[PDB]
Amino acid sequence: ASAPIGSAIPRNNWAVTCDSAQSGNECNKAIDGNKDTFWHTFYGANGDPKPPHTYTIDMKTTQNVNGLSVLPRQDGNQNGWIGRHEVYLSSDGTNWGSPVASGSWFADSTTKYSNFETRPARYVRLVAITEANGQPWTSIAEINVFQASSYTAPQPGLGRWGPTIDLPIVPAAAAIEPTSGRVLMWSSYRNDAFEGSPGGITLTSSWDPSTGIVSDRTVTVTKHDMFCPGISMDGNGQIVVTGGNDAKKTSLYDSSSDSWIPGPDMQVARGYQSSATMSDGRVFTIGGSWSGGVFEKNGEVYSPSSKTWTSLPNAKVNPMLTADKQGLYRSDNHAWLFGWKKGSVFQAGPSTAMNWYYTSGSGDVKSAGKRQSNRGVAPDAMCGNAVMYDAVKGKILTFGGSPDYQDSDATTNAHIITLGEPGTSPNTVFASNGLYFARTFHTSVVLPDGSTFITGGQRRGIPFEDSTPVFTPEIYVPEQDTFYKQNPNSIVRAYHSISLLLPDGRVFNGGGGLCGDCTTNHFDAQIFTPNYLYDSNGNLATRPKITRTSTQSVKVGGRITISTDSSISKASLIRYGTATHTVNTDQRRIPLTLTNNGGNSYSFQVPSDSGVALPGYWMLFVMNSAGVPSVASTIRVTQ
Ligand SMILES: [Ca+2]
Ligand SMILES: [Cu+2]
C-alpha cells in the first residue's frame, strides 16, 4: 500500500460538508470509523451530478496538518474512485489559497494518500476533480487527516518546499521531455511493484509544470519493463533506456512525438548499469549485474545512426569494480560515468579507482588514479552522486554513498575532480569540509548558477525502508567552496527516489519505495523552489526574460545572439536530465562567456569540443545582477 507522514487526527468532534450526498450515504459516513459505510454523491432518483465533487472538514481547532488519506468503498463497487484531485487547507474555511497537493490517484480500491509539508490549519478540503474512470460519482468509505508532531516555519533565504504532486505510480525513474517541458516518469510492470514481472510492460506517468496535469500511459510497444535501467539522451535527441527487468531490451523515448520506439537489443544483458552519451552522440554502457546474470560485463556502444549495439570487450569492467561485500551483483552497479573528449568516457566512481574508458576498436580502459585528497584515499561510495557542474573546466563534484550497496554506513565524503585530457590522471581534492549529513540513495541536480542541490537519502542504506532519513537538503557553492543547509522537507526520499532540474529553475524531487506490498511506496513528488527565485521579502522575484534568440539549434563551436528585457550578469547552458537509482549521466553545466553587444543584446559561443558540449538538448539560463534566473530557453546542440 503506502503511508502518511504524520498521525491520524481524532474525528469525534469534526463537522463535515459535501457538495451532495445520497440518503444513507451521508457526508459523515466517511468519518464514522466503519470501513463498510461510505459517503456517496447524488445518484439514481437524485440525478447524477458530475465532478468536481468536494469534501470539507472543520476540525474545530488548529492542527499541524501534513497529510490525508482516502479509503475507497470496500464492497467491490468501483464507480466512485477519485482520480484527479486537489487538497486545500484554511484557517477560516473561506480562503483556501493554492492547493497543498494535487495530482491523480491510480484507479483501484487501495487506500490513497496525499502527503505534504506541515501547515497549521483548522479546515481541510478535498476536491475530486474527476472520477478515476470518468464516471459521474465520488465516494469515500473513510477519510482521515494526519498531523505532524510539531510545526516550524521555513527559514527565510533557504528555499521552499511545496506543493506535492500526487501520482498514480512510484516514479523510480524520470526524465525531462525537453520539447514539451513535461516530466516523464516510470515504475515497472505495475504501479508500485517490479517483483515477479512477466516483462514487456512499463507503467509511465507524466506531469506538466504549466498545467499541473498528471497523465498516465501503459507502454508495451517496446516489449520492455524498464525498471532498473541505464538511461541516456543520445545525439539524435532520443532517450535510450536499457535493460533492467527485461535485461537485453533497448527502448527509445522520442520527446518530439511523445512516443516510445523499439531499439536494438544490447549485446549483453544488464540491469542497474550506468550508460553515458558520448562526444559523437552515441551511448556507452558497462557493468550492470542486477539482472541478466552475474558475471563480468564489459563495455558496449550504441549507434543511433546504424541502430546497433556493438560489444567493446576490451573496455574492461574489472578496474571499476567496488569491493562490495555482496560481490559482482552490486560491485559493477551505477558507475559515475561522464562522456568526455574524443569518444572517451570518464568513470569517477563509485569505486576508489577512477578510470578512462575508450570506445575505438574493441575498447580500452586506463587507470586515472584513485579518488583522494590530503585527508586520504576515498573509500568506495556506492550510490554516492557525481555532478559535472562546470564542464568547460572539467569540474565534477562527488559526495555521499557507502562502501557497500546496503547495510552500510553512508559518509559525508565529497570531492572535486578536475578533468583534463583523456588518459591523464585528474587532480582530486576534498570539497569544503564535506556534507553536513552523511547520506546514500540521495539525488542531486546542478542549478543555473553552478551550485549543486543535494537532497534526500538516509544515513544507513537499507533499500525499501525509510529509516535514518535525511530531511535537510544541502547546496554546494563552488566559488565559496562551502555547503549550505536549505529548508527541510517532510517526505523520506531514499532508495528509488529521483531529482531533476525543471526548465523553470525549480527542482522536481520524488519517488522512493517501489516494493509492492510495502508501506514505504511514495506515489508522489515535491517541488523545491530555490532561494534565487525569491526577493528579500520572501516573495517571488521578478525574473529576466530572454526576448529573442538568433537560433534554437546550434553546432558545437557555433554562436548564439540573444536579447533580454533587462541587463544580465551571467548565463549558463544546462543539459537536460534523466534520473534513476542516484544516476544522472545526462545533466552537466557550461558557464557561458558573454559578449555584451549593448542594448541588452548578448552573444556567446557553444564550446567547440563536443566532449564538453555533449550533443543533445540544453537549457539556456540567464541571470540578472540579483542572481535571479530566467526560465530556460531550449537549445539543441549538434556535433
Ligand atoms: Ca465509513
Ligand atoms: Cu532498485
Side-chain angles (χ1 to χ4, degrees), residues 182-265:
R182 293 191 296 267
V183 187
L184 170 67
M185 300 162 271
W186 63 90
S187 50
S188 191
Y189 81 113
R190 279 177 50 198
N191 62 349
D192 63 11
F194 71 86
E195 299 87 350
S197 175
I201 305 167
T202 299
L203 262 50
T204 72
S205 179
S206 70
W207 176 70
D208 193 329
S210 66
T211 68
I213 298 292
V214 174
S215 53
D216 52 27
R217 189 190 322 184
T218 300
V219 183
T220 53
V221 57
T222 66
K223 299 174 181 303
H224 190 178
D225 177 344
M226 298 183 249
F227 175 74
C228 275
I231 314 174
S232 296
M233 173 78 74
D234 67 23
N236 283 14
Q238 300 186 325
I239 304 187
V240 180
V241 179
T242 48
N245 248 6
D246 286 301
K248 262 189 171 156
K249 301 306 292 182
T250 303
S251 296
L252 309 166
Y253 174 76
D254 186 89
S255 186
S256 299
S257 59
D258 187 31
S259 67
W260 291 90
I261 302 163
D265 286 3

Coordinates of all heavy atoms in Angstrom, one line a residue, residues 182-265:
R182 N 7.6 18.7 -20.1 CA 6.9 17.8 -19.2 C 7.9 16.9 -18.5 O 9.0 16.6 -19.0 CB 5.9 16.9 -19.8 CG 4.7 17.7 -20.3 CD 3.5 16.8 -20.7 NE 3.9 16.0 -21.9 CZ 3.6 16.3 -23.2 NH1 3.0 17.4 -23.4 NH2 4.0 15.5 -24.1
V183 N 7.6 16.4 -17.3 CA 8.4 15.4 -16.5 C 7.8 14.0 -16.9 O 6.6 13.8 -16.7 CB 8.3 15.6 -15.0 CG1 9.3 14.6 -14.4 CG2 8.7 17.0 -14.6
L184 N 8.7 13.2 -17.4 CA 8.3 11.8 -17.7 C 8.8 10.9 -16.6 O 9.9 11.1 -16.1 CB 8.9 11.4 -19.1 CG 8.8 9.9 -19.4 CD1 7.4 9.5 -19.6 CD2 9.7 9.6 -20.7
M185 N 7.9 10.0 -16.2 CA 8.3 9.1 -15.0 C 7.9 7.7 -15.3 O 6.9 7.5 -16.1 CB 7.6 9.6 -13.7 CG 7.9 11.0 -13.3 SD 6.7 11.6 -12.1 CE 5.5 12.4 -13.3
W186 N 8.6 6.7 -14.8 CA 8.0 5.3 -14.9 C 8.4 4.5 -13.7 O 9.3 4.8 -13.0 CB 8.5 4.7 -16.2 CG 9.9 4.5 -16.4 CD1 10.7 3.3 -16.0 CD2 10.8 5.3 -17.1 NE1 12.0 3.5 -16.4 CE2 12.1 4.7 -17.1 CE3 10.7 6.6 -17.7 CZ2 13.2 5.3 -17.6 CZ3 11.8 7.2 -18.2 CH2 13.0 6.6 -18.2
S187 N 7.7 3.4 -13.6 CA 7.9 2.5 -12.4 C 8.3 1.1 -13.0 O 9.5 0.9 -13.2 CB 6.6 2.4 -11.6 OG 5.4 2.1 -12.5
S188 N 7.4 0.2 -13.2 CA 7.7 -1.1 -13.7 C 6.4 -1.6 -14.3 O 5.6 -0.9 -14.8 CB 8.1 -2.0 -12.5 OG 8.6 -3.3 -13.0
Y189 N 6.2 -3.0 -14.3 CA 5.0 -3.5 -15.0 C 3.8 -3.2 -14.2 O 2.7 -3.3 -14.7 CB 5.2 -5.1 -15.2 CG 4.9 -5.9 -14.0 CD1 3.8 -6.8 -13.9 CD2 5.7 -5.9 -12.8 CE1 3.5 -7.6 -12.8 CE2 5.5 -6.7 -11.7 CZ 4.4 -7.5 -11.7 OH 4.1 -8.3 -10.6
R190 N 4.0 -2.9 -12.9 CA 2.9 -2.4 -12.0 C 3.2 -1.0 -11.5 O 4.3 -0.6 -11.6 CB 2.7 -3.4 -10.8 CG 1.9 -4.6 -11.2 CD 1.8 -5.6 -10.0 NE 1.4 -4.9 -8.8 CZ 1.5 -5.3 -7.5 NH1 2.1 -6.5 -7.3 NH2 1.1 -4.6 -6.5
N191 N 2.2 -0.4 -10.9 CA 2.4 1.0 -10.5 C 3.4 1.1 -9.3 O 4.0 2.2 -9.1 CB 1.1 1.6 -10.1 CG 0.4 0.9 -8.9 OD1 0.8 -0.2 -8.5 ND2 -0.7 1.5 -8.4
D192 N 3.6 0.1 -8.5 CA 4.4 0.1 -7.3 C 5.2 -1.1 -7.1 O 5.7 -1.4 -5.9 CB 3.6 0.4 -6.1 CG 2.6 -0.7 -5.7 OD1 2.6 -1.8 -6.4 OD2 1.7 -0.4 -4.9
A193 N 5.3 -2.0 -8.1 CA 6.0 -3.3 -7.9 C 6.7 -3.7 -9.1 O 6.3 -3.4 -10.3 CB 4.9 -4.3 -7.5
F194 N 7.9 -4.3 -9.0 CA 8.7 -4.9 -10.0 C 8.8 -6.4 -9.9 O 9.2 -7.1 -10.9 CB 10.1 -4.2 -10.0 CG 11.0 -4.7 -8.9 CD1 11.7 -5.9 -9.0 CD2 11.0 -4.0 -7.7 CE1 12.5 -6.3 -7.9 CE2 11.8 -4.4 -6.6 CZ 12.6 -5.6 -6.7
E195 N 8.5 -6.9 -8.7 CA 8.7 -8.2 -8.3 C 7.8 -9.2 -9.1 O 6.6 -9.0 -9.2 CB 8.5 -8.4 -6.8 CG 9.4 -7.6 -5.9 CD 8.9 -6.2 -5.6 OE1 7.9 -5.7 -6.2 OE2 9.5 -5.6 -4.7
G196 N 8.4 -10.3 -9.6 CA 7.6 -11.2 -10.3 C 7.0 -10.7 -11.6 O 5.8 -10.9 -11.9
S197 N 7.8 -9.9 -12.3 CA 7.3 -9.3 -13.6 C 7.3 -10.3 -14.7 O 8.3 -11.0 -14.8 CB 8.1 -8.1 -13.9 OG 7.7 -7.6 -15.2
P198 N 6.3 -10.4 -15.5 CA 6.4 -11.2 -16.8 C 7.1 -10.4 -17.9 O 7.3 -11.0 -18.9 CB 4.9 -11.3 -17.1 CG 4.3 -10.0 -16.7 CD 5.0 -9.6 -15.4
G199 N 7.6 -9.2 -17.6 CA 8.3 -8.4 -18.6 C 7.3 -7.9 -19.6 O 6.2 -8.2 -19.7
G200 N 7.9 -7.0 -20.5 CA 7.2 -6.5 -21.6 C 6.2 -5.3 -21.4 O 5.6 -4.9 -22.4
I201 N 6.2 -4.8 -20.2 CA 5.2 -3.7 -19.8 C 5.9 -2.7 -18.9 O 6.5 -3.1 -17.9 CB 4.0 -4.3 -19.1 CG1 3.3 -5.4 -19.9 CG2 3.0 -3.2 -18.7 CD1 2.3 -6.2 -19.1
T202 N 5.7 -1.4 -19.2 CA 6.1 -0.4 -18.3 C 4.9 0.6 -18.1 O 4.3 1.1 -19.1 CB 7.3 0.4 -18.8 OG1 8.4 -0.4 -18.9 CG2 7.7 1.6 -17.9
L203 N 4.6 0.9 -16.8 CA 3.7 1.9 -16.5 C 4.4 3.3 -16.4 O 5.4 3.4 -15.6 CB 3.0 1.6 -15.1 CG 1.6 1.0 -15.3 CD1 1.6 -0.1 -16.2 CD2 1.0 0.6 -13.9
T204 N 3.9 4.3 -17.1 CA 4.5 5.6 -17.1 C 3.5 6.7 -16.7 O 2.3 6.4 -16.8 CB 5.1 6.0 -18.5 OG1 4.0 6.2 -19.4 CG2 6.0 4.8 -19.1
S205 N 4.0 7.8 -16.3 CA 3.2 8.9 -15.9 C 3.9 10.2 -16.3 O 5.1 10.2 -16.3 CB 2.9 8.8 -14.4 OG 2.0 9.9 -14.0
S206 N 3.2 11.2 -16.6 CA 3.9 12.5 -16.8 C 3.2 13.6 -16.1 O 2.0 13.6 -15.8 CB 4.0 12.8 -18.3 OG 2.7 13.1 -18.9
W207 N 4.0 14.6 -15.8 CA 3.4 15.8 -15.1 C 3.8 17.1 -15.9 O 5.0 17.3 -16.2 CB 3.9 15.9 -13.7 CG 3.5 17.2 -13.0 CD1 2.2 17.5 -12.6 CD2 4.3 18.3 -12.6 NE1 2.2 18.7 -11.9 CE2 3.5 19.2 -11.9 CE3 5.7 18.5 -12.7 CZ2 4.0 20.4 -11.4 CZ3 6.2 19.7 -12.2 CH2 5.4 20.6 -11.6
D208 N 2.9 17.9 -16.2 CA 3.1 19.1 -17.0 C 3.2 20.3 -16.0 O 2.1 20.7 -15.4 CB 2.0 19.3 -18.0 CG 2.3 20.4 -19.0 OD1 3.0 21.4 -18.7 OD2 1.8 20.3 -20.2
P209 N 4.3 20.9 -15.8 CA 4.5 22.1 -14.9 C 3.6 23.2 -15.2 O 3.3 24.0 -14.4 CB 6.0 22.4 -15.0 CG 6.6 21.2 -15.5 CD 5.6 20.5 -16.4
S210 N 3.2 23.4 -16.5 CA 2.5 24.5 -16.9 C 1.0 24.4 -16.7 O 0.2 25.4 -16.6 CB 2.7 24.8 -18.4 OG 2.2 23.7 -19.2
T211 N 0.5 23.1 -16.5 CA -1.0 22.9 -16.3 C -1.3 22.2 -15.0 O -2.4 22.1 -14.6 CB -1.6 22.1 -17.5 OG1 -1.1 20.8 -17.5 CG2 -1.3 22.8 -18.8
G212 N -0.3 21.5 -14.5 CA -0.4 20.7 -13.3 C -1.0 19.3 -13.6 O -1.3 18.5 -12.7
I213 N -1.3 19.1 -14.9 CA -1.9 17.8 -15.2 C -1.0 16.6 -15.1 O 0.1 16.6 -15.7 CB -2.5 17.9 -16.6 CG1 -3.6 19.0 -16.7 CG2 -3.1 16.5 -17.0 CD1 -4.8 18.7 -15.9
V214 N -1.5 15.6 -14.4 CA -0.8 14.3 -14.4 C -1.5 13.4 -15.3 O -2.7 13.1 -15.2 CB -0.8 13.7 -13.0 CG1 -0.3 12.3 -13.0 CG2 0.0 14.5 -12.0
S215 N -0.8 12.8 -16.2 CA -1.3 11.8 -17.1 C -0.6 10.4 -16.9 O 0.3 10.3 -16.1 CB -1.0 12.2 -18.6 OG 0.3 12.5 -18.8
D216 N -1.2 9.4 -17.5 CA -0.5 8.1 -17.4 C -0.7 7.3 -18.7 O -1.5 7.6 -19.6 CB -1.0 7.3 -16.2 CG -2.6 7.2 -16.2 OD1 -3.2 7.3 -17.3 OD2 -3.1 7.0 -15.1
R217 N 0.2 6.3 -18.9 CA 0.2 5.5 -20.1 C 0.9 4.2 -19.9 O 1.8 4.1 -19.1 CB 1.0 6.3 -21.2 CG 0.9 5.7 -22.6 CD 1.9 6.4 -23.5 NE 2.0 7.9 -23.3 CZ 2.7 8.7 -24.0 NH1 3.4 8.3 -25.1 NH2 2.7 10.0 -23.7
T218 N 0.4 3.1 -20.5 CA 1.0 1.8 -20.4 C 1.7 1.5 -21.7 O 1.2 1.5 -22.8 CB -0.1 0.8 -20.2 OG1 -0.8 1.0 -19.0 CG2 0.5 -0.6 -20.1
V219 N 3.0 1.3 -21.6 CA 3.9 1.1 -22.7 C 4.3 -0.3 -22.9 O 4.9 -0.9 -22.1 CB 5.2 2.0 -22.6 CG1 6.1 1.8 -23.8 CG2 4.8 3.4 -22.3
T220 N 3.8 -0.9 -24.0 CA 4.0 -2.3 -24.4 C 4.7 -2.5 -25.7 O 5.2 -3.5 -26.0 CB 2.7 -3.1 -24.4 OG1 1.8 -2.5 -25.2 CG2 2.1 -3.2 -23.0
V221 N 4.7 -1.4 -26.5 CA 5.1 -1.4 -27.9 C 6.6 -1.8 -28.0 O 7.1 -2.4 -29.0 CB 4.9 -0.1 -28.6 CG1 5.5 1.1 -27.9 CG2 5.3 -0.1 -30.1
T222 N 7.4 -1.4 -26.9 CA 8.8 -1.7 -26.9 C 9.1 -3.1 -26.2 O 10.3 -3.4 -26.0 CB 9.7 -0.6 -26.3 OG1 9.3 -0.5 -24.9 CG2 9.4 0.7 -27.0
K223 N 8.1 -3.8 -25.8 CA 8.2 -5.1 -25.1 C 9.3 -5.0 -24.0 O 10.2 -5.9 -23.9 CB 8.5 -6.1 -26.1 CG 7.5 -6.3 -27.2 CD 7.9 -7.3 -28.3 CE 6.9 -7.5 -29.4 NZ 5.5 -7.9 -28.8
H224 N 9.1 -4.0 -23.1 CA 10.2 -3.7 -22.2 C 9.7 -3.2 -20.9 O 9.0 -2.1 -20.8 CB 11.1 -2.7 -22.8 CG 12.4 -2.4 -22.1 ND1 13.4 -1.5 -22.5 CD2 12.9 -2.9 -20.9 CE1 14.4 -1.5 -21.7 NE2 14.1 -2.3 -20.7
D225 N 9.9 -3.9 -19.8 CA 9.7 -3.5 -18.4 C 11.0 -2.7 -18.0 O 12.0 -3.4 -17.7 CB 9.4 -4.6 -17.5 CG 9.2 -4.2 -16.0 OD1 9.6 -3.1 -15.6 OD2 8.7 -5.1 -15.2
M226 N 10.9 -1.4 -18.0 CA 12.1 -0.6 -17.9 C 12.6 -0.2 -16.5 O 13.3 0.8 -16.3 CB 11.8 0.7 -18.7 CG 11.6 0.5 -20.2 SD 11.3 2.0 -21.1 CE 9.6 1.9 -21.5
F227 N 12.1 -1.0 -15.5 CA 12.6 -0.8 -14.2 C 14.1 -1.2 -14.1 O 14.5 -2.1 -14.8 CB 11.8 -1.7 -13.2 CG 12.3 -1.7 -11.8 CD1 12.1 -0.6 -11.0 CD2 12.9 -2.8 -11.3 CE1 12.6 -0.6 -9.7 CE2 13.4 -2.8 -10.0 CZ 13.2 -1.7 -9.2
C228 N 14.9 -0.4 -13.3 CA 16.3 -0.7 -13.1 C 17.2 -0.5 -14.4 O 18.1 -1.4 -14.6 CB 16.6 -2.0 -12.5 SG 16.5 -2.1 -10.7
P229 N 17.0 0.5 -15.2 CA 17.7 0.6 -16.5 C 18.9 1.5 -16.5 O 19.1 2.3 -15.6 CB 16.6 1.1 -17.4 CG 16.0 2.2 -16.5 CD 16.1 1.6 -15.1
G230 N 19.6 1.5 -17.6 CA 20.5 2.6 -18.0 C 19.7 3.6 -18.7 O 18.7 3.3 -19.4
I231 N 20.0 4.9 -18.5 CA 19.3 6.0 -19.2 C 20.3 7.0 -19.8 O 21.2 7.5 -19.1 CB 18.4 6.7 -18.3 CG1 17.5 5.7 -17.4 CG2 17.4 7.6 -19.1 CD1 16.6 6.4 -16.4
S232 N 20.2 7.2 -21.1 CA 21.0 8.3 -21.8 C 20.2 9.0 -22.9 O 19.5 8.4 -23.7 CB 22.3 7.8 -22.4 OG 23.1 7.3 -21.4
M233 N 20.3 10.3 -22.9 CA 19.8 11.1 -24.1 C 20.8 11.1 -25.2 O 21.9 11.7 -25.0 CB 19.4 12.5 -23.7 CG 19.0 13.4 -24.9 SD 17.3 13.0 -25.5 CE 16.4 13.9 -24.2
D234 N 20.6 10.5 -26.3 CA 21.6 10.4 -27.4 C 21.6 11.6 -28.3 O 20.8 12.5 -28.1 CB 21.5 9.1 -28.2 CG 20.2 9.0 -29.1 OD1 19.6 10.1 -29.4 OD2 19.8 7.9 -29.5
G235 N 22.6 11.7 -29.2 CA 22.8 12.8 -30.0 C 21.6 13.1 -31.0 O 21.5 14.2 -31.5
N236 N 20.8 12.1 -31.2 CA 19.6 12.2 -32.1 C 18.4 12.6 -31.3 O 17.3 12.6 -31.9 CB 19.3 10.9 -32.8 CG 20.3 10.6 -33.9 OD1 21.3 11.2 -34.1 ND2 19.9 9.6 -34.8
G237 N 18.6 13.0 -30.1 CA 17.5 13.6 -29.3 C 16.5 12.6 -28.8 O 15.3 12.9 -28.5
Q238 N 16.9 11.3 -28.6 CA 16.1 10.3 -28.1 C 16.7 9.7 -26.9 O 17.9 9.5 -26.8 CB 15.9 9.2 -29.2 CG 15.2 9.7 -30.4 CD 14.9 8.7 -31.5 OE1 15.6 7.7 -31.6 NE2 13.8 8.9 -32.2
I239 N 15.8 9.4 -25.9 CA 16.3 8.8 -24.6 C 16.4 7.3 -24.8 O 15.5 6.7 -25.1 CB 15.3 9.1 -23.5 CG1 15.1 10.7 -23.4 CG2 15.8 8.5 -22.2 CD1 14.3 11.1 -22.2
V240 N 17.6 6.9 -24.5 CA 18.0 5.5 -24.7 C 17.9 4.8 -23.4 O 18.6 5.1 -22.5 CB 19.4 5.3 -25.3 CG1 19.7 3.8 -25.5 CG2 19.5 6.0 -26.6
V241 N 16.9 3.9 -23.2 CA 16.6 3.2 -21.9 C 17.0 1.8 -22.1 O 16.4 1.1 -22.9 CB 15.2 3.4 -21.5 CG1 14.9 2.7 -20.2 CG2 14.9 4.9 -21.5
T242 N 17.9 1.3 -21.3 CA 18.5 -0.1 -21.5 C 18.3 -1.1 -20.4 O 18.6 -0.8 -19.2 CB 20.0 0.0 -21.8 OG1 20.6 0.9 -20.8 CG2 20.2 0.6 -23.2
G243 N 17.8 -2.3 -20.7 CA 17.9 -3.4 -19.8 C 16.9 -3.2 -18.6 O 15.8 -2.7 -18.7
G244 N 17.4 -3.7 -17.4 CA 16.6 -3.7 -16.2 C 15.8 -5.0 -16.1 O 16.3 -6.1 -16.3
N245 N 14.5 -4.9 -15.9 CA 13.6 -6.1 -15.7 C 13.6 -6.9 -16.9 O 13.5 -8.2 -16.8 CB 12.2 -5.7 -15.3 CG 11.9 -6.1 -13.8 OD1 12.7 -6.6 -13.1 ND2 10.6 -5.9 -13.4
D246 N 13.6 -6.3 -18.1 CA 13.9 -7.1 -19.4 C 15.4 -6.7 -19.8 O 15.6 -5.7 -20.4 CB 12.9 -6.7 -20.5 CG 11.6 -7.3 -20.3 OD1 11.5 -8.5 -20.2 OD2 10.6 -6.5 -20.2
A247 N 16.3 -7.6 -19.4 CA 17.7 -7.1 -19.3 C 18.4 -6.9 -20.7 O 19.5 -6.3 -20.7 CB 18.5 -8.2 -18.5
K248 N 17.9 -7.4 -21.8 CA 18.5 -7.1 -23.1 C 17.8 -6.0 -23.9 O 18.3 -5.7 -25.0 CB 18.6 -8.4 -23.9 CG 20.0 -9.1 -23.7 CD 20.2 -10.2 -24.7 CE 21.6 -10.7 -24.7 NZ 21.8 -12.1 -25.1
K249 N 16.7 -5.5 -23.5 CA 15.9 -4.6 -24.3 C 16.4 -3.2 -24.3 O 17.0 -2.7 -23.3 CB 14.4 -4.6 -23.9 CG 13.8 -6.0 -23.9 CD 13.9 -6.7 -25.3 CE 13.1 -5.9 -26.3 NZ 13.2 -6.6 -27.7
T250 N 16.3 -2.5 -25.5 CA 16.5 -1.1 -25.5 C 15.2 -0.4 -26.0 O 14.6 -0.9 -27.0 CB 17.6 -0.8 -26.5 OG1 18.8 -1.4 -26.2 CG2 17.9 0.8 -26.6
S251 N 14.8 0.6 -25.3 CA 13.6 1.4 -25.7 C 14.1 2.8 -25.9 O 15.0 3.3 -25.3 CB 12.6 1.4 -24.6 OG 12.0 0.1 -24.4
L252 N 13.5 3.5 -26.9 CA 13.8 4.9 -27.3 C 12.6 5.8 -27.0 O 11.5 5.5 -27.6 CB 14.2 5.0 -28.7 CG 15.3 4.0 -29.2 CD1 15.4 4.0 -30.7 CD2 16.7 4.4 -28.5
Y253 N 12.7 6.8 -26.2 CA 11.7 7.7 -26.0 C 12.0 9.0 -26.8 O 13.0 9.6 -26.7 CB 11.5 8.2 -24.5 CG 10.5 9.3 -24.4 CD1 9.2 9.0 -24.5 CD2 10.9 10.6 -24.3 CE1 8.2 10.1 -24.5 CE2 10.0 11.6 -24.2 CZ 8.7 11.4 -24.3 OH 7.8 12.4 -24.3
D254 N 11.0 9.3 -27.7 CA 11.2 10.5 -28.6 C 10.3 11.6 -28.1 O 9.1 11.5 -28.1 CB 10.8 10.1 -30.0 CG 11.1 11.2 -31.0 OD1 12.2 11.3 -31.5 OD2 10.1 12.0 -31.2
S255 N 10.9 12.7 -27.6 CA 10.2 13.8 -27.0 C 9.3 14.5 -28.0 O 8.2 14.9 -27.8 CB 11.2 14.8 -26.4 OG 10.5 15.9 -25.7
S256 N 9.9 14.6 -29.3 CA 9.2 15.4 -30.3 C 7.8 14.8 -30.6 O 6.8 15.6 -30.8 CB 10.0 15.4 -31.6 OG 11.2 16.0 -31.4
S257 N 7.7 13.5 -30.6 CA 6.4 12.8 -30.9 C 5.8 12.3 -29.7 O 4.7 11.7 -29.7 CB 6.7 11.7 -31.9 OG 7.6 10.8 -31.4
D258 N 6.4 12.4 -28.5 CA 6.0 11.9 -27.2 C 5.6 10.4 -27.4 O 4.5 10.0 -27.0 CB 4.8 12.7 -26.7 CG 4.4 12.3 -25.3 OD1 5.2 11.9 -24.5 OD2 3.2 12.4 -25.0
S259 N 6.5 9.6 -27.9 CA 6.2 8.2 -28.2 C 7.4 7.4 -27.9 O 8.6 7.8 -27.9 CB 5.8 8.0 -29.6 OG 6.8 8.3 -30.5
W260 N 7.2 6.1 -27.7 CA 8.2 5.1 -27.5 C 8.4 4.2 -28.7 O 7.5 3.8 -29.3 CB 7.9 4.2 -26.3 CG 7.9 4.9 -24.9 CD1 6.9 5.5 -24.3 CD2 9.1 5.0 -24.1 NE1 7.3 6.0 -23.1 CE2 8.6 5.7 -22.9 CE3 10.4 4.5 -24.1 CZ2 9.5 6.0 -21.9 CZ3 11.2 4.8 -23.1 CH2 10.8 5.6 -21.9
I261 N 9.7 4.0 -29.0 CA 10.1 3.3 -30.2 C 11.1 2.1 -29.9 O 12.0 2.3 -29.1 CB 10.8 4.2 -31.3 CG1 9.8 5.4 -31.6 CG2 11.3 3.5 -32.5 CD1 10.5 6.6 -32.3
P262 N 10.8 0.9 -30.4 CA 11.8 -0.1 -30.1 C 13.2 0.2 -30.6 O 13.4 0.8 -31.7 CB 11.2 -1.3 -30.9 CG 9.8 -1.0 -31.1 CD 9.7 0.5 -31.2
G263 N 14.2 -0.2 -29.7 CA 15.6 -0.1 -30.1 C 16.1 -1.5 -30.3 O 15.4 -2.5 -30.1
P264 N 17.4 -1.6 -30.7 CA 18.0 -3.0 -30.8 C 18.3 -3.6 -29.5 O 18.6 -2.8 -28.5 CB 19.3 -2.7 -31.6 CG 19.7 -1.3 -31.3 CD 18.3 -0.6 -31.2
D265 N 18.3 -4.9 -29.3 CA 18.8 -5.5 -28.1 C 20.2 -5.2 -27.8 O 21.0 -5.1 -28.8 CB 18.6 -7.0 -28.1 CG 17.1 -7.4 -28.0 OD1 16.2 -6.5 -27.9 OD2 16.8 -8.6 -27.9

